[PDB]
Ligand binder design. Structure first.
Ligand SMILES: Nc1ncnc2c1ncn2[C@@H]1O[C@H](COP(=O)(O)OP(=O)(O)OP(=O)(O)O)[C@@H](O)[C@H]1O
Ligand SMILES: [Mg+2]
Ligand SMILES: [Zn+2]
Lengths: 123, 498, 418, 52, 186, 628
RNA sequence: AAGAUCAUCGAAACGGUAUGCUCCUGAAAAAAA
RNA sequence: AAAUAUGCAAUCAAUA
RNA sequence: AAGCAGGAUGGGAUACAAAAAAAA
């Protein structure tokens, strides 16, 4: 409890969960899953700007700094902003935005391979 | 404490969450009294709350519903909606359970069947011995099962038998269970039949009574070259004597014969003699006789006088009030079967000696007594029991109003005819019927779908004539004729039977 | 004479040597710390009797009576508790002391007890690991140590117990079932079968209406099933029965596992299967810190990279914690019960949901803070053993209120101040 | 009359799951009642108040 | 139906910059209510005092250098709320509330218009019980709000619920950089 | 003792079994105190001990042989010791009272007057005790007196149980000697509070384990009335005490910090007997042994019944039920005949593995008992003796469908026999795992019908008419079992209902509907304790669900029920209103009631309040035939 | 909120100047080891 | 004990 | 086997296939 990462209230501003199962992860994992599941997203949608991000579908490429830095650029620091963003203006959870993006992309849940769901927080 | 639990449960069902709905459904399943209106409300609530359940919870709800046979459009729609979620990454156990539940609940529809059939066909290899036997039984029970599915089941059974080859007992049991399941839907297969024949030849003596009966039934259904004939040279007399010595074994043998639809003259005569000898004991009358008589009547013994004597035994009538309502319903169903057989024999459809006026009067008196005793116990019965009672009352009224009954008996039979039992969805082939333009009508105790050299033995009841096959079972024929009469009463006349 | 409902809150005294012999695996909870507090090196050690302990003793006695009646006859088993028990509550209530009191009683009454006070030792201590195709990580040294700890007391009972040949020869190297091991390799099979089916289709095409189409489909499906089964048979899983085909007793399997490091996990799992499918003695699987098996272990792997685990391996994926984390297997157990206790020394209870693990609310026993009488008995015992120095009788209620009756709080406060 | 097929069953042929239908209806209601602030590019300029 | 709406509550919050001005406004409101024409009592509202707010601006004491000499300019505000319930004399109440203001005092008015919906269905006289054949053979306090206490309770509960909803919505929708959504082109 | 001086492990291998002790009457205890007067006096820092001895001497003088404590006006001004002594004296007097021709009649009238005075004094003493806060000894004495007199108060008992639990679990439970002199003649002699509570009879243990602990609002809600929670208090500021604009000056002129931020602590319930109840449940479970008596097995069954709380946690309750069922199955029919009503009533609530066989054995025992006692002159005497035995063997502090735990002329005997038979039939029909055969059902129904016909009304004050409470209980049991009520017994019950409602109307002590609502509320008032809207709804449902298809009686009963429930229909639980409407919209119902304007308005309002309820289904629910 | 309580790993395992990749603001904080 | 699963500020009960 | 003004650390399981009287 001294340094437990939930606060006293067990806040999970970055956690996301699937309502179809008990699977849950965070925003960085969601971004990684989105980059890995481009083929499914592109197939559902259906040299070119559309496929420009395909190279990032490789696990080894992402593990390499060449891909890790791209991952960290895409997934910035939602909990870090300007210094004036304090008190009543502290950052809020972007879990809603991430869930909306995932649902619109129709990315599949790793544990149940569903299509929708992916509510905010942790179930 | 001074409140009506059924009403409280009804209002909770109207306003309950998924967990509360599951608890209410379990309470209803385990409760004594069953309310068809409550079941309809539960089905509607399940359809409303379908999206809020998981695959396992949906399976549990389906099993709870199947506990008391019941289904409807709401349940069918919910199952169709959640079938894809159920079948995402399915297990062989889940596939078998879904197939069995669909067969039991009558959810015969292209949407509910085609994906399940495809998944079972693809994962045919994953199934083990017990799951494969369950699938074989379910497919045999089903209507117009796919030839590729049947062949896959046969190949899997043959391969598992080869892999396997106490041990002899298990091998014989698995082989002949699969063989009977496949023979219920006769078709052309070679390897499994050859393996079964070889096993019978090798271990004919090791066959227990139940396995021998299963082998005989499968051979008769499939018109095989010969399997029973090796089993004949096995001294089955000792096995039959052991089975008939004890009443419990006698009831087990009767149940097995009824399940296998086996009608052998010698076995039926020996079973009838055993039942008559055991009827002297009070225990057999109170426990086994009510169901043993029904099983015998369903097996249709050649001599109809013996069941009449057993039903009209004075001590049986004396002990009738102590019997449970289920036993009274079973006795009434046996009486209805006897009456139908007598009617067919007298009309010429069947062959043999019809009951004489003496036996007719005795049967009428027994039926009147049983109905009078059951009338104050009608609610203490399941939906299946109520449907069987309704069919029996329909037959009795067709015989009498169209054998005489008291005015109270006639009134009770009319009430049974006019009563609601909530018949479940029917079983029909998926491909043949164009379900997109069909409706359901409650006829007698069954739901009938309405669209807007084989010797054809005929049966008649109340003014109907059908070109039914040679081997039509008594209860099935009686139920079909009663359903046709109910349709005529409703207003539907064009009836097609295949 | 025995123990009555009026004896709750009093201490049973054990000789130190007898207690050590009865519990060779070590005392559960922190009773060792109280023993260390005790100045004298020869005075007997006392353990208090609580309501939960008494009720569990009654449950075990009913189970023993029912199973003894069944064995003598060889319905009743339905009237005896199955599965087992879960001990839960606040830190320091005495959950581990309940087991400390029970397990010696069961062993004295001839119960085969598989007792683990520190399940976290197999997830936090240093030891080599190896991954299998199933997904379980093998801990050969830890499995050997666990077998040795089991044999410290259960050697003679294991020797007496016969071996079930039907059960023997089914566990894989990592301990998982042979069927699960087979399933683990189904992907490469599937690929090979696809290649073979393509080749056979090419052969058929070289050889070459609705009836013909359906006949071809049926024949191809049958050939696919035959090839599937042939490849499944071809798949192989090493078995210990090859080296040890006829083990006279389960202790022979245990000794073989101890002697061979490559088969320690398999031997332990076979012993577990025998304990499941045994009907000669009453079995009790006791775990003190059962909740410590689930949290992540000190082991780190690249196959658990992410914010959920940050590269740590979940402890219940390791061989011994995975074996010890199962609770529903007590149903599979015929003549055995499973008692598991929780611990919150490291992490708080928080939203603890044992139902997800598979424990029903009927199987949960709650142990709470000492009542005033139990606290007074505890302090009197401490004074008699001389742990405390000149504790006045006037501050008993004051210190009870200060400590809230919690055992840990009372112990630490009394040691610090007196 | 009691038609076996239901409107949900008829709709299921197209591929509209009940969960998807519920979510689509909820989203349509929310867009009708609240607005079209879907965070599209350039929406910050329009949502940002002026200060002239 | 506009003709059916009732003024459930009217809460006037006088905001003043001077205690004397606030007291003058309160006395004027009291006097206005004391002369209201129509058991019957004047529409006395329920007083509700609100705290005092302050603000500061800090400056140096010198025109050049000497940063350690500083001066503080402190401002004050006062707020006082009076609530009328089940207001029938809307014109009289509004006139009194607006004419009570004195000096620079301003007022913020909080109106609630309630519609009761479909009227409850009238139940006729219940059937009478008759013996059977067997039997045959054999406001007051001055200065207090005159409205119903339960009515006031319901109004207060509704007010608290709407206040909670407003706080939740405002806190969720608050931003330091308005118009920015995460991962959108910044 | 081993070589190390440690007790052998065989001395801890088993858990002891608990016994039972008789409930010594307070009259006997007082007589023993009087006999031992001199001995105790001779047997009996320094100032404290002298004060204690003097108080003991005074208490002995008061309780045993020595403006008095028996002053009605000054009863409300008594201390704890005086109040408890007065309660014990009143209990002893009540026990003693319970246990030419003109002169005899006058003596009987004087005895009745004395009993009424004793009851009034008991009520006053109970009120004074509720006002006061009692110590542990006082609480134990009050509880023992209440158990002995079978006089339980729904408000006083929980406090006594809390005090008993606190004293039991106190650190001084086994060390502090008892002070009251009455404990010096206790059998067995207990020198500690824990010892005394362990000695307590199994009946007292069952009482403490099954204390009701419910509020009047909850009781009304269960009975069928809508009882919303009381609104929390509100204080509205007034113009006469409005806060000044300048609160800084007000705060400065104050001596202390009068006002602060809102901080209010709320009392949280702390195990009000829920630990002592578990301890006594464990005592009861351990009390199950072959040497135990049925008079103790009944108490164990009461402990293991539904109860106010689940004293036994998890598998402890099913296992205790199974053990008790096995023990009962192991007894003969003679040992179970005295205890049939209580055992059946307690065990019909639970459903365990052995419940079916146990209830079959009890059915056989009851079949024998009916014939033995002549329930199928001398026969009347046998029935009277059987009813007296059953009601006397009913354990103290317990209720069976309204049957009190005391003794029950021909009409009164027939009425009590009918009550007992109805309770037995309900208990046997409620069971879930056991379904009585039609033969047994008809036997019991015919016996009850014969008793009712023997009753006065079929062949007078309110005590001579079967209660609508029992009628509704029996009808609900019949409806849930699945057997239609026999026409003869149904007609007898309908006649009883009509007679009692008519008697109430005759003896009853702008307002178009206020008078009707007042009449209905008086009829259903807790004071009478004979009617309930739920009972009326069950009666209407039973009438609407007769044997599948006399009529005059059915219509009259339905009209009377509708008249009784209509004025307060809006003040009932939605389930009750739904049941009423469904029963009254059946085919076997008076068309006039379903056509009255009031009924239509009530139905429309109920439909509006419950949109999910289809109007068509009304009249064809819960197993009824619609009027279509 | 931290410094907490509790409970682990533990001594330059301190220190964080320095260093191209990344993030925030803004029209603009660029290049670069 | 079938109650809870327990860290604290700088505003608000005249309203959380 | 630390007579410590250090540093770092504070992750519970879930939608799953492991112990292999009714045509019921
Ligand atoms: N029955 C008992 N006899 C003696 N001491 C006891 C008993 N119960 C508790 N204690 C004391 O209280 C503490 C018991 O610690 P224990 O490990 O048993 O607690 P726990 O409930 O298992 O907690 P944790 O969550 O830390 O695992 C020790 O201080 C022990 O001295
Ligand atoms: Mg512990
Ligand atoms: Zn998912």
């Amino acid at each position: 409890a001294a340094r437990r990462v939930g606060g006293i209230g067990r806040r999970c501003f970055l956690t996301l969960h699937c309502s179809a199962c008990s699977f849950f992860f965070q925003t960085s994992d969601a971004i990684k899953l989105i980059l890995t599941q481009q083929h499914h997203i592109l197939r559902k949608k259906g040299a070119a700007s559309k496929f420009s991000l395909l190279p990032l579908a490789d696990a080894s490429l992402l593990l390499k700094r060449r891909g890790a830095l791209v991952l960290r650029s895409l997934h910035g620091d939602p909990l870090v902003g300007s210094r004036r963003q304090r008190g009543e203006f502290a950052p809020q959870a972007p879990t809603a935005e991430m869930a909306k993006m995932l649902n619109k992309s129709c990315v599949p849940c790793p544990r149940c391979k569903r299509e929708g769901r992916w509510e905010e927080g942790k179930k | 404490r001074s409140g009506y639990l059924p009403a409280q449960r009804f209002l909770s069902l109207l306003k309950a969450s998924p967990e509360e709905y599951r608890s209410l459904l379990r309470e209803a399943t385990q409760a004594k009294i069953v309310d068809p209106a409550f079941l309809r409300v539960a089905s509607q609530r399940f359809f409303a709350l379908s999206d809020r359940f998981y695959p396992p919870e949906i399976l549990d709800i389906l099993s709870d519903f199947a506990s008391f046979p019941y289904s409807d459009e709401a349940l069918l729609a919910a199952v169709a909606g959640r079938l894809e979620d159920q079948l995402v990454e399915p297990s062989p156990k889940r596939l078998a359970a879904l197939l069995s539940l669909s067969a039991r609940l009558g959810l015969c529809h292209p949407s509910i069947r085609d994906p399940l059939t495809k998944h079972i066909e693809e994962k045919m290899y994953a199934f083990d011995a017990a799951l494969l036997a369950s699938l074989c039984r379910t497919v045999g029970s089903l209507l117009s099962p796919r030839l590729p599915l049947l062949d896959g089941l046969a190949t899997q059974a043959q391969l598992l038998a080869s892999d396997l080859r106490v041990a002899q007992r298990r091998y014989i049991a698995f082989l002949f269970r699969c063989l009977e399941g496949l023979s219920r839907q006769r078709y052309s297969h070679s390897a499994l039949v050859d393996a079964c024949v070889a096993c019978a030849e090798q271990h004919g003596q090791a066959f227990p009574l139940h396995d021998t009966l299963r082998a005989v039934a499968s051979a008769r259904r499939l018109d095989l070259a010969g399997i029973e004939e090796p089993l004949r040279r096995s001294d089955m007399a000792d096995k039959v004597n052991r089975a008939t010595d004890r009443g419990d074994q006698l009831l087990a043998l009767l149940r097995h014969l009824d399940l296998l639809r086996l009608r052998d003259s010698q076995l039926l005569q020996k079973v009838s003699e055993a039942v008559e000898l055991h009827s002297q004991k009070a225990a057999f009358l109170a426990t086994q006789l009510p169901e043993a008589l029904l099983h015998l009547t369903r097996l249709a013994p050649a001599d109809l006088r013996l069941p009449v004597a057993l039903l009209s035994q004075p001590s049986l009538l004396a002990m009738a009030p102590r019997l449970s309502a289920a036993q009274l319903q079973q006795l009434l169903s046996a009486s209805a079967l006897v009456l139908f057989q007598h009617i067919q024999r007298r009309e010429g459809g069947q062959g043999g000696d019809p009951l004489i006026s003496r036996e007719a009067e005795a049967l009428a008196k027994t039926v009147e007594r049983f109905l009078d005793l059951l009338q104050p116990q009608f609610l203490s019965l399941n939906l299946r029991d109520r449907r069987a009672l309704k069919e029996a009352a329909s037959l009795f009224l067709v015989e009498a109003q169209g054998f005489a009954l008291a005015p109270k008996t006639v009134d009770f039979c009319c009430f049974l005819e006019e009563a609601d039992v909530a018949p479940p969805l029917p079983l029909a082939p998926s491909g043949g019927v164009d379900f997109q333009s069909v409706g359901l009508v409650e006829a007698c105790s069954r739901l009938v779908l309405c669209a807007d050299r084989e010797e054809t033995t005929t049966c008649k009841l109340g003014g109907v004539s059908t070109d039914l096959p040679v081997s039509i079972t008594p209860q099935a024929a009686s139920s079909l004729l009663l359903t046709q009469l109910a349709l005529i009463r409703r207003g539907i006349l064009r009836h097609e039977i295949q | 004479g025995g123990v009555g409902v009026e004896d709750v809150g009093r201490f049973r005294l054990f000789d130190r040597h007898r207690l050590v012999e009865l519990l060779p695996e070590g005392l559960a909870g922190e009773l060792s710390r109280d023993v260390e507090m005790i100045p004298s090196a020869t005075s007997p050690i006392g353990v208090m009797l609580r309501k939960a302990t008494l009720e569990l003793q009654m449950q075990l006695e009913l189970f023993a009576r029912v199973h003894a009646k069944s064995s003598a006859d060889t319905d009743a088993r339905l009237a005896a508790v199955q599965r087992g028990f879960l001990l839960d509550g606040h830190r320091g209530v005495g959950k581990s002391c309940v087991l400390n009191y029970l397990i010696p009683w069961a062993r004295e009454n001839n119960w085969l007890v598989v007792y683990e006070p520190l399940p976290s030792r197999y997830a936090r201590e240093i030891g080599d690991i190896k991954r299998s195709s199933a997904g379980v990580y093998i801990q050969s040294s830890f499995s050997q140590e666990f077998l040795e700890r089991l044999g410290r007391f259960n050697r003679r009972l294991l020797e007496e117990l016969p071996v079930a040949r039907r059960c023997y020869g089914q566990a894989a190297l990592d301990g998982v079932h042979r069927l699960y091991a087979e399933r683990s390799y189904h992907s490469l099979l599937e690929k090979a079968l696809e290649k073979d089916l393509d080749e056979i289709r090419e052969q058929r095409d070289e050889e070459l209406l609705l009836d013909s189409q359906l006949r071809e489909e049926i024949l191809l499906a049958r050939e696919r099933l035959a090839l599937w089964h042939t490849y499944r048979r071809e798949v192989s899983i090493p078995s210990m029965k090859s080296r040890l085909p006829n083990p006279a007793s389960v202790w022979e399997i245990a000794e073989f596992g101890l002697q061979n490091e490559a088969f320690a996990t398999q031997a332990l799992y076979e012993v577990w299967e025998q304990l499941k499918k045994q009907t000669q003695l009453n079995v009790l699987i006791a775990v003190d810190e059962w909740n410590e098996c689930f949290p992540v272990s000190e082991y780190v792997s690249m196959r658990y990279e992410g914010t959920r685990f940050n590269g740590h391996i979940p402890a219940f994926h390791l061989s011994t914690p995975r074996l010890l984390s199962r609770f529903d297997d007590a149903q599979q157990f015929q003549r055995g019960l499973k008692i598991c206790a929780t611990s919150w020394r490291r992490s708080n209870r928080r939203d603890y949901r044992p139902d997800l693990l598979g424990v029903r609310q009927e199987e949960i026993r709650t142990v709470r803070n000492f009542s005033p009488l139990e606290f007074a008995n505890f302090v009197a015992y401490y004074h008699k053993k001389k742990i405390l120095h000149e504790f006045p009788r006037e501050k008993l209620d004051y210190f009870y209120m200060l400590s809230g009756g919690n055992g840990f709080q009372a112990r630490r406060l009394l040691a610090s101040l007196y | 009359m009691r038609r076996l097929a239901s409107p949900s069953l008829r709709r299921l042929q197209e591929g509209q799951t009940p969960h998807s239908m519920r979510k689509s209806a909820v989203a349509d209601a929310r867009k009708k009642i609240f607005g079209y602030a879907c965070g599209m590019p350039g929406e910050e300029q329009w949502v940002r108040p002026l200060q002239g | 139906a506009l003709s059916a709406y009732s003024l459930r509550s009217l809460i006037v919050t006088y905001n003043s910059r001077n205690r004397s001005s606030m007291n003058a406004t309160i006395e004027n409101l009291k006097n206005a209510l004391r002369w209201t024409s129509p058991s019957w009592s004047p529409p006395w509202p329920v007083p509700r005092r609100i705290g005092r707010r302050q603000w500061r601006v800090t400056y140096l004491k010198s025109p050049f250098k000497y940063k350690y000499a500083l001066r503080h300019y402190v401002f004050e505000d006062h707020r006082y709320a009076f609530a009328f319930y089940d207001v029938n004399s809307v014109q009289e109440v509004v006139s009194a509330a607006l004419g009570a203001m004195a000096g620079e005092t301003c007022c913020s008015c909080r109106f609630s218009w309630r519609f009761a919906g479909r009227p409850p269905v009238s139940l006729p006289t219940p059937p009478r019980l008759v013996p059977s054949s067997r039997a045959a053979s054999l406001t007051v306090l001055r200065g207090h709000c005159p409205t119903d206490k339960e009515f006031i309770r319901r109004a207060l509960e509704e007010e608290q619920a709407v206040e909670r909803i407003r706080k939740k919505l405002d806190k969720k929708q608050l931003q330091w950089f308005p118009g920015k959504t995460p991962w959108a082109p910044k | 003792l081993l070589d190390t001086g440690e007790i052998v492990p065989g001395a801890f291998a088993s858990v002891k079994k608990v016994g039972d002790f008789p409930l010594l009457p307070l009259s006997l205890l007082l007589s023993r105190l009087k006999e031992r007067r001199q001995e105790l006096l001779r047997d009996w820092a320094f100032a404290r001990e002298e004060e204690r001895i003097q108080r003991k001497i005074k208490i002995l003088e008061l309780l045993a042989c020595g403006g008095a404590i028996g002053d009605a006006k000054r009863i409300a001004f008594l201390a704890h010791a005086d109040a408890v002594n007065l309660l014990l004296l009143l209990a002893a007097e009540a026990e003693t009272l319970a246990r030419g021709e003109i002169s005899k009649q006058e003596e009987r009238k004087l005895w009745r007057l004395k009993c009424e005075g004793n009851e009034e004094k008991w009520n006053l003493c109970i009120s004074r005790l509720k006002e006061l806060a009692l110590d542990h000894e006082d609480s134990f004495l009050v509880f023992y007196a209440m158990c002995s007199t079978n006089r339980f108060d729904a408000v006083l008992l929980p406090a006594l149980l809390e005090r008993l639990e606190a004293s039991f679990f106190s650190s001084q439970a086994l060390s502090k000697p008892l002070f009251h002199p009455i404990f010096e003649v206790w059998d067995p002699p207990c020198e500690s509070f824990a010892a005394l509570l362990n000695v307590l009879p199994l009946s007292a243990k069952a009482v403490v384990v099954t204390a009701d602990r419910r509020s009047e609002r909850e009781r009304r809600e269960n009975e069928g009335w809508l009882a919303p929670p009381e609104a929390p208090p509100l204080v509205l500021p007034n113009w006469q005490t409005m806060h000044p604009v300048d609160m800084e000056a007000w705060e400065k002129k104050q001596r202390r910090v009068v006002r602060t931020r809102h901080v209010k602590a709320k009392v949280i319930r702390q195990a009000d007997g829920r630990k002592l109840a578990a301890t006594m449940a464990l005592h009861g479970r351990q009390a199950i042994h072959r040497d135990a008596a049925v008079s103790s097995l009944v108490s164990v069954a009461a402990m293991c019944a539904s109860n106010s709380q689940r004293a036994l946690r998890g598998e402890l309750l099913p296992e205790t039920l199974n053990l008790l069922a096995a023990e009962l199955l192991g007894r003969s029919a003679d040992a179970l005949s005295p205890h049939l009503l209580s055992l059946s009533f307690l065990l019909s609530q639970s459903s365990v593995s052995l419940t079916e066989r146990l209830f079959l054995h009890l059915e056989a025992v009851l079949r024998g008992w009916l014939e033995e006692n002549g329930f199928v002159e001398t026969a009347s005497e046998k029935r009277r003796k059987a009813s007296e035995e059953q009601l006397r063997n009913l354990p103290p502090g317990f209720n069976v469908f309204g049957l009190v735990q005391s003794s029950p002329a021909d009409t009164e005997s027939a009425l009590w026999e009918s009550r007992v038979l109805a309770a037995l039939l309900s208990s046997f029909l409620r069971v879930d795992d056991y379904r009585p055969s039609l033969d047994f059902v008809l036997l019991l129904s015919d016996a009850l019908r014969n008793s009712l016909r023997r009753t006065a009304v079929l062949s007078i004050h309110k005590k001579d008419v079967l209660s609508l409470k029992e009628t509704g209980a029996l009808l609900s049991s019949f409806a849930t079992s699945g057997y239609a009520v026999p026409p003869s017994l149904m007609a007898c019950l309908v006649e009883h209902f009509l007679y009692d409602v008519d008697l109430f109307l005759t003896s009853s002590p702008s307002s178009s509907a206020e008078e009707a609502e007042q009449l209905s509320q008086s009829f259903f008032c807790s004071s009478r304790g004979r009617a309930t809207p739920g009972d009326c709804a069950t009666l209407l449902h039973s009438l609407a669900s007769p044997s599948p298809l006399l009529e005059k009686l059915r219509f009259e009963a339905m009209t009377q029920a509708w008249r009784l429930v209509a004025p307060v229909l809006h003040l009932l639980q939605p389930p009750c209103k739904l049941l009423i409407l469904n029963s009254l919209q059946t085919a076997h119902a008076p068309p006039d009631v379903s056509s009255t304007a009031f009924f239509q308005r009530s139905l429309e309002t109920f439909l509006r309040d419950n949109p999910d309820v289809d109007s068509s289904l009304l009249g064809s629910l819960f197993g009824t035939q619609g009027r279509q």
